[PDB]
Design a protein around this ligand. Structure first.
Ligand SMILES: Cc1cc2nc3c(=O)[nH]c(=O)nc-3n(C[C@H](O)[C@H](O)[C@H](O)COP(=O)(O)OP(=O)(O)OC[C@H]3O[C@@H](n4cnc5c(N)ncnc54)[C@H](O)[C@@H]3O)c2cc1C
Length: 451
């Protein structure tokens, strides 16, 4: 039966709850305790579910192709609630107004020049320049052997205008990252693979030429959190119990909390990475000290069903140069059939790296900024019936070239200074829900080798 040894999982978001699920199965004889600092499980995942609404406060969905989360959802009995996103028309907002996303393009890279050059997003001259670059690529281009930033890869092939006006805001989406720092190999390795096969970027994207790509749940993403807790059979969940310190107990660890210590043999930290650095002072973790973040607010406005749709499609992304506080907005009721059946619901995002001060301001200042933006964008006065504001402090890390190797080195240092302490979550192996689930599964698995 039960071993003397104990696993403590720290953080009750998706990474920590997934970790407990997988730990229950991998180690029938190991004791499992989960410490969550706040009043609830779920971390960033939270769903507003009153008055027949199902409106996401944090992540709204996940990439279906990352099927580990689909598999978890099925295994725990939630498969029947899976819904896909509707596709219709999306837009880029810049200083020149609301432009439809150009047709004839894969990830903003033109594959049909005639259709693409109908766009108003670039000037005629910029369009001619994109065409000349695509059809007549320089012999001086070289396929990158080592990883380089996306912007360094893309700018010489496509020019600055297309990268700035279309690709960056398209590919960054609600996350708002900087195209010029993100890794090429870790984000879009198929660009390079296809270029190498087709001999040019334009013909590489043409190999890739063609119900949306995303999954959520009818009962809301928070129902996933709730079901995970429910299917745990022996893990002890302690809410309102932040981990405050880690000390050595002759090979084991003493974990300090407000209500007395927990003793552990294995510790999985799934909490924000700057708390990792502070909790593990004998570990030299500059990689984690230099991993930056920004904060995001979501501001959701519920309107009585509208005769003139405020946005004529699923939503828009905003060019960072334009005079707006919002970085993106979604017509939730257009994108998700289940969320708000008899209403018009808009969800705006606010916050970029190096520019997120609005997120720390009051609800009235945040709301007013979002309202002004939309009233200008939509042409008219808008009178929301209800507003739901959520704030995801330090929520998005900026992964740059060499991240994955830096995280390997962080993990080796932690294992060498604190044997039995493992890390998982959004700082490490990908920001998205499925990446975090995988992060949890792989770290649980690797404890399995070490017993
Ligand atoms: C604005 C925004 C939008 C996003 N949209 C998407 C999306 O559409 N699709 C997608 O796939 N991903 C999205 N993500 C990424 C997604 O949120 C992450 O994949 C996921 O929530 C990370 O979960 P986690 O458990 O690692 O961290 P968190 O959700 O941050 O959970 C950390 C937990 O640890 C707890 N904690 C903190 N300190 C302590 C302590 N000292 N002791 C104990 N517990 C502590 C916290 O209270 C929390 O419960 C989005 C992220 C943001 C910021």
């Amino acid at each position: 039966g039960m071993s003397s040894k104990r696993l403590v999982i720290v953080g009750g978001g998706i990474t920590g709850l997934a970790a407990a699920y997988y730990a229950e199965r991998a180690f029938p004889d190991l004791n499992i305790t989960l410490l969550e600092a706040g009043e609830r499980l779920g971390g960033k995942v939270a769903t507003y579910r009153e008055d027949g609404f199902t409106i996401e406060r944090g992540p709204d969905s996940y990439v279906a192709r990352k099927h580990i989360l689909t598999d978890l959802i099925e295994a725990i009995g939630l498969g029947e609630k899976l819904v896909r996103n509707n596709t219709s028309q999306a837009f880029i907002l810049d200083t020149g107004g609301l432009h439809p996303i150009p047709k004839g393009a894969v990830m903003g890279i033109p594959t049909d020049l005639d259709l693409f050059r109908q766009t108003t997003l670039l000037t005629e001259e910029e369009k001619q320049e994109v065409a000349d670059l695509l059809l007549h690529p320089s012999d001086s281009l070289r396929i990158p052997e080592q990883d380089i930033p996306l912007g360094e890869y893309l700018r010489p092939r496509l020019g600055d205008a297309l990268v700035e006006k279309l690709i960056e805001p398209l590919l960054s989406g609600i996350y708002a990252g900087n195209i010029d720092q993100m890794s090429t190999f870790a984000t879009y390795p198929q660009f390079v693979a296809n270029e190498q096969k087709a001999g040019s970027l334009f013909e590489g994207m043409r190999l890739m030429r063609p119900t949306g790509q995303f999954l959520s749940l009818e009962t809301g993403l928070e129902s996933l959190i709730e079901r995970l807790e429910e299917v745990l059979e022996r893990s002890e969940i302690r809410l309102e119990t932040p981990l405050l310190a880690i000390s050595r107990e002759d090979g084991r660890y003493r974990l300090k909390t407000d209500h007395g210590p927990e003793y552990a043999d294995y510790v999985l930290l799934t909490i924000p990475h700057p708390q990792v650095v502070q909790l593990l002072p004998d570990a030299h973790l500059p990689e984690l000290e230099q991993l930056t973040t920004h904060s995001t607010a979501t501001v959701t406005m519920i309107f009585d069903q509208q005769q003139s749709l405020p946005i004529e499609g699923t939503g828009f992304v905003v060019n960072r140069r334009a005079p707006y506080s919002i970085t993106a907005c979604t017509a939730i009721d257009q994108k998700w059939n289940h969320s708000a059946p008899d209403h018009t619901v808009l969800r705006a995002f606010v916050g970029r790296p190096g520019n997120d001060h609005l997120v720390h301001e009051s609800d009235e200042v945040l709301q007013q900024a979002v309202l002004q933006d939309l009233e200008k964008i939509c042409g008219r006065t808008l009178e929301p019936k209800q507003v739901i504001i959520s704030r995801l402090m330090d929520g998005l890390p900026a992964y740059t070239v060499g991240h994955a190797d830096r995280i390997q080195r962080v993990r080796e240092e932690v294992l060498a200074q604190y044997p039995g302490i493992y890390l998982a979550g959004l700082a490490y192996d990908g920001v998205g829900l499925p990446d975090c689930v995988a992060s949890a599964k792989t770290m649980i698995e690797s404890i399995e080798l070490e017993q």
